[PDB]
Design an enzyme around this catalytic site. Structure first.
Site, short mmCIF file in Angstrom:
data_model
loop_
_atom_site.label_atom_id
_atom_site.label_comp_id
_atom_site.label_asym_id
_atom_site.label_seq_id
_atom_site.Cartn_x
_atom_site.Cartn_y
_atom_site.Cartn_z
N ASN A 54 0.79 -1.23 0.00
CA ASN A 54 0.00 0.00 0.00
C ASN A 54 0.83 1.28 0.00
OD1 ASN A 54 0.44 0.57 3.06
ND2 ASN A 54 -0.30 -1.56 2.98
N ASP A 64 3.34 -9.61 1.71
CA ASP A 64 3.96 -8.66 2.62
C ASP A 64 3.99 -9.16 4.06
OD1 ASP A 64 4.68 -6.85 0.67
OD2 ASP A 64 2.91 -5.58 0.93
N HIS A 115 9.74 -1.18 -2.85
CA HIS A 115 8.38 -0.85 -2.47
C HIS A 115 7.62 -0.33 -3.68
CE1 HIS A 115 5.01 0.36 -0.04
NE2 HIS A 115 5.17 1.64 -0.32
#
Ligand SMILES: OC[C@@H](O)[C@H](O)[C@@H](O)CO
Ligand SMILES: OC[C@@H](O)[C@H](O)[C@@H](O)CO
EC number: 3.1.3.84
Lengths: 249, 249
Positions: A54, A64, A115
């Protein structure tokens, strides 16, 4: 020379990968720990792992959550979010986090976490059957492209999960196809000009815009055996990506 | 100390800006040349300008066409795309291009162009009345947030156009509201914690996810006079952004 390691607990995803991907590539069915346990018997190397979570860097859910447990839990997540500046990162962006700092907590040969946010927050699925392109094919392609484009040049391998197939809700058949297209473009290397790759992405994502298709690229298509007419009407829901990137390349 | 300069040829956009924005801010109705001509009588300074175009860096259409003409046309566009690596940049990313290199073509005190792609290619509008949030409020907020977050700290002012209101098709009323929210967050400075700003963005974009709303932030809301209940049900289509960021701040 970088190795692509596809890892997912869903056999549906892993099977599709095997069928779609033309050593340089490894497919592992199981959790992250399972992959690390199997690579140890041969790690006798530097890796980057993709975290497609996110916009805030919280590590929960599927893949994750595995990274969360693998690197140290809450304390690690807190350190991770701080490395990301503790602020909102838009979907479509990518940030490389260097774990090397752990040595100054450390875990195996995994040195980087890329990320690549795919959702603002997991309050609902991102996929909508009404528009598979905008909410399925496109977001997965973008996340894969970003992961590839931001992968440090010094790593031996890149670990990637089944993008957006968790809470996000993108069907595996859709996610795997976009992941395969991104990989085909990447594996083509310099055999396809940077500009023609731009054109292939454009039509793949269904943003046909002739002014961005230079004559030099049309000339290259003919040389490469890429059918220009099928390219201009490419429909990801019906056509094979092989049309865009003939395996001959 | 950075000045925000909003510039658009559409009086509809400029009027809405005046009505929505609480010196530190300038609003100019007219073309880019018009803005540069008026700032000269007082430029007797370093600026960054936002280019919210496409994933490939081509400069056509509205505001970008103005940048295209202002900086040198085709030769400049070619140089610009090369500075961007000549590759596909995903929507949601941002790249700062330094014009300083011109000195080594140069034009006024504009030193940086912040490339913030809002569409892959202008083959069609991005807006869809069926989902104003995902195709209107969100993309404009993200582009504005990216522009602000990537603005070099050394500039005196940031020039920004009416984001996504051209071919993109986002209604000015929608675009201006998201631009105003991003600016309010920015102008709040350190008066609102980085974490609470994350929460405000989350609810503004309608991704209500309690686990990302820490107790510390609820405590801060009460201190700041931010109604937590109205925050949790914030509806950008009906509620005033003042609820999220009271002008008292
Ligand atoms: O983002 C990838 C997802 O997290 C997947 O790993 C799912 O959990 C399982 O297919
Ligand atoms: O991206 C901003 C757009 O280019 C606008 O400047 C329109 O051309 C006019 O409102």
């Amino acid at each position: 020379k970088m190795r692509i390691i596809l890892c997912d607990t869903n056999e549906v995803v892993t099977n599709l990968w095997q069928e779609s991907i033309p050593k340089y590539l490894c497919i592992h069915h199981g959790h992250l720990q399972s992959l690390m346990d199997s690579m140890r018997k041969g790690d006798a190397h530097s890796y980057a792992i993709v975290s497609p979570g996110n916009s805030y860097g919280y590590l929960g859910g599927g893949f994750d959550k595995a990274l969360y447990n693998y690197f140290g839990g809450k304390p690690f997540e807190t350190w991770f979010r701080n490395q990301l500046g503790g602020r909102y990162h838009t979907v479509g962006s990518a940030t490389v986090v260097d774990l090397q700092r752990c040595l100054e907590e450390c875990r195996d040969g995994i040195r980087y976490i890329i990320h690549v946010p795919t959702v603002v927050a997991p309050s609902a699925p991102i996929f909508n059957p009404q528009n598979p392109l905008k909410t399925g094919f496109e977001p997965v392609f973008n996340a894969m492209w970003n992961a590839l484009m931001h992968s440090p040049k010094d790593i031996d391998g890149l670990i990637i999960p089944g993008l957006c197939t968790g809470y996000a809700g993108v069907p595996p058949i859709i996610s795997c196809k976009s992941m395969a297209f991104a990989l085909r473009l990447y594996m083509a290397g310099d055999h396809i000009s940077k500009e023609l790759k731009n054109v292939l992405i454009m039509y793949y994502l269904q943003y046909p815009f002739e002014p961005f298709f230079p004559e030099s690229c049309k000339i290259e298509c003919q040389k490469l055996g890429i059918d220009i007419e099928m390219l201009k009407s490419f429909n990801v829901e019906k056509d094979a990506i092989e049309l865009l990137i003939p395996r001959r390349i």
